[PDB]
Write a protein that binds this DNA or RNA. Structure first.
Length: 88
RNA sequence: AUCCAA
């Protein structure tokens, strides 16, 4: 498969889906926040990316938020594409 | 409703 869908995922950058078209960063901060200090959040059309300041925090938020109720259905949580690959 | 950032 092409590298657009393959590569090493970050232990801190989480993928979250499915989402409604009305999810908010304030919702995910209450769900994922109790798992450690968060680095960044971004909500999008069908998903969001929740990053942690620690790998153990994100790894726990997967093992705890994966399969939780949101928009009347169980969502999923797993590792997402690695951040900070941008040039410098 | 399934990968965007940096």
């Amino acid at each position: 498969m092409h590298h657009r869908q393959e590569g090493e995922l970050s232990n801190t950058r989480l993928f979250v889906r499915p989402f409604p078209l009305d999810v908010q960063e304030s919702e995910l901060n209450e769900i994922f926040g109790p798992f450690g200090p968060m680095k960044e959040v971004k909500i999008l059309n069908g998903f969001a990316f929740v990053e942690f300041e620690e790998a153990e925090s994100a790894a726990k938020a997967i093992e705890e938020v994966h399969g939780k109720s949101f928009a009347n259905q169980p969502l999923e949580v797993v590792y997402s594409k690695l951040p900070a690959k941008r040039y410098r």
